[PDB]
Design an enzyme around this catalytic site. Sequence first.
Site, PDB file in Angstrom:
ATOM      1  N   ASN A  42       0.739  -1.131   0.040  1.00  0.00           N
ATOM      2  CA  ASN A  42       0.171   0.027   0.274  1.00  0.00           C
ATOM      3  C   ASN A  42       0.963   1.252   0.002  1.00  0.00           C
ATOM      4  OD1 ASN A  42       0.622  -0.461   2.921  1.00  0.00           O
ATOM      5  ND2 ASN A  42      -1.398   0.357   3.393  1.00  0.00           N
ATOM      6  N   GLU A  60      -3.474  -4.318  -2.803  1.00  0.00           N
ATOM      7  CA  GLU A  60      -4.094  -5.329  -3.920  1.00  0.00           C
ATOM      8  C   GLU A  60      -4.385  -4.618  -5.019  1.00  0.00           C
ATOM      9  OE1 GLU A  60      -4.930  -4.741  -0.532  1.00  0.00           O
ATOM     10  OE2 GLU A  60      -6.742  -5.859  -0.218  1.00  0.00           O
ATOM     11  N   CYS A  93     -10.202  -4.870   1.220  1.00  0.00           N
ATOM     12  CA  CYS A  93     -11.565  -4.079   1.419  1.00  0.00           C
ATOM     13  C   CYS A  93     -12.428  -3.948   0.182  1.00  0.00           C
ATOM     14  CB  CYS A  93     -10.979  -2.397   1.669  1.00  0.00           C
ATOM     15  SG  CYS A  93     -10.357  -1.690  -0.012  1.00  0.00           S
ATOM     16  N   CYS A 129     -10.915  -3.275  -3.255  1.00  0.00           N
ATOM     17  CA  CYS A 129     -10.141  -4.228  -3.689  1.00  0.00           C
ATOM     18  C   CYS A 129     -10.892  -5.435  -4.176  1.00  0.00           C
ATOM     19  CB  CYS A 129      -9.152  -4.212  -2.748  1.00  0.00           C
ATOM     20  SG  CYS A 129      -7.999  -3.106  -2.335  1.00  0.00           S
TER      21      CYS A 129
HETATM   22 ZN   LIG Z   1      -8.281  -2.133  -0.312  1.00  0.00          ZN
END
Ligand SMILES: [Zn+2]
Lengths: 121, 122, 121, 122
Positions: free
Chosen positions: B43, B56, B87, B90
Site C-alpha cells: 500500500n 491489492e 477492502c 479491492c
Molecule cells: Zn483495499
Amino acid sequence: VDWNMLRGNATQAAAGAYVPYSRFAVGAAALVDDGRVVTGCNVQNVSYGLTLCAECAVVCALHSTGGGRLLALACVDGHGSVLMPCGRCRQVLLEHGGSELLIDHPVRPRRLGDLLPDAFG
Amino acid sequence: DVDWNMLRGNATQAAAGAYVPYSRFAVGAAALVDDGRVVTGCNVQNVSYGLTLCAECAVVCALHSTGGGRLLALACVDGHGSVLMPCGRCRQVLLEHGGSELLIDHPVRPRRLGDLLPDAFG
Amino acid sequence: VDWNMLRGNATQAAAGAYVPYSRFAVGAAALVDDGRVVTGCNVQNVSYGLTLCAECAVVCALHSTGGGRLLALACVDGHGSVLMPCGRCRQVLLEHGGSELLIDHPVRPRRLGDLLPDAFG
Amino acid sequence: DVDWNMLRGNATQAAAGAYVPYSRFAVGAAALVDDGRVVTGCNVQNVSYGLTLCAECAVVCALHSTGGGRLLALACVDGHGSVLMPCGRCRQVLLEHGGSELLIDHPVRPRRLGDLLPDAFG
Ligand SMILES: [Zn+2]
Ligand SMILES: [Zn+2]
Ligand SMILES: [Zn+2]
Ligand SMILES: [Zn+2]
C-alpha cells in the site's frame, strides 16, 4: 535525463494497459534517484471510479522495488503521444517526487510544482 | 495447486515496502497469475487520504505491467504477517482480473472471491 | 421500510447523473435513522478513476444534512432497475450503516454484511 | 459578483458536518452555481483511507443532486476556518464542472482553477 529513453519505456508500458471500457491506453515511466526506471500502465474497472492511472501504477512499482524518489517521468498514450498527468496523479506524484520532479511535455518538460502550484499537503 | 505458504511469505516481504507515514499500517499482497508467475504490491498512502492505493491495487498494476493474464490466488497481510481480507474496493478491482473463483488467503481456509463479494456489480 | 418510496426517490435521483462517458445513469436513496431520506447520483470524470458513485453521493449528503446512520438504501439505473452497489460502495456504506444496513434487491433486500462478509475494518 | 464572505462562511459551517475519525482534519466547502444557488460539502473518511471523499467531491455530488449546472466559485476551509487549496484530485474533479475560470478562494486573492491546474489532462 534521457527523455527519449523514458518516452520509449512509457510507450512500451502502454502496451500492457487494461482499457476495455474506453480503449485509451496510457503508459508511464519514471527515473528513480538510484538510476533505475520503473513503469506502469492504466487499469480500468467496470466501476469507472476504481480505475488506476499509469502514474499511480508507477508509484506502486516504486515502492515494490525498493522505494526512493522520482526524478523524472514521461506519460504517453498508446500512440506514443505525450500526456499530462490528471490532477489526482499530480498529487500522488508530488508525494514521491516533490515540486522539482520533471514531467515530460511535448514542448519542454515541466516542474511538477508548476503543474500543481500551491499544492495541498 | 496453490502454494499458500509461498504466497503468504511473499506478501509478508512485500509489506516492508509500504509507504504508510499517516497510519503506519503496512499491507503487502502477493498473487499467483495463470502463467505461474507471482506479482506483489504494497500500500501507498497520500496526504490526501482518498488517493491512497491499496496493496491489492498495486498487485493488479503489477499484473498488467508484467504481461497481463488472470489472477488465480492472492494473499494479503499486514506488517506483522497477519492475513487480511481485502477492502470492498479491492474486492471489486480483484474481481475484474480473477473473477469469482479467485482464491483469497484466510487464516482457516482460503475463500473464493465470489463468496466475499456476492451478487457483484458488473 | 417503504421500498417503493426509496426506489422512487432513487429513480428520480438518477435523472441528475453526470455520465457523458458511458451514459449509465445511477441514482440512490437512503433512509436515515431520523426518518429523513437522502439521495445521490453518479458523477463521472474525464479521468475515469475520479468518478463518484451514487452511493458515495448518498454518504456525502448524509453528513452534509446532519449525519446519522443509514437504515436502508435502494440503488437503481436510469431505467429504474435495481442495481447492486460496487465493492467500493459496500465498504463506504458499511462505515455509515454497518452490517445490518438493508440494500434493495429485485428478489429480496439483503443485509450489507451478507453483501460484504468478513469486511475489512 | 461573488460574495466570498458568504461562501467562506458557508464552507466553514459545512466543515462541522465532517466525518473524520481517522485524522480529525475536518474540511468544508461551498460553491456558487450559475443559477445563483449555493451547494456545500464536507469530507468523509473511510477505514480504507483510499475511499475517503473530499469536501470538494461532496460539493460536485450536491451540484448534480440539486439540478446540475456549472460552478462559478468555490471556497474550501479547514475546521478552524482557514482557507485551503484543493488537492490534485479535487482540482481535476472541479475542472469538469467549472472549467478553467472557476474561482477558488485564497487568503490574499481568489485564483482561477486554470492557474492551479495548468495544461490539464482532458
Ligand atoms: Zn483495499
Ligand atoms: Zn491520473
Ligand atoms: Zn460504487
Ligand atoms: Zn481533495
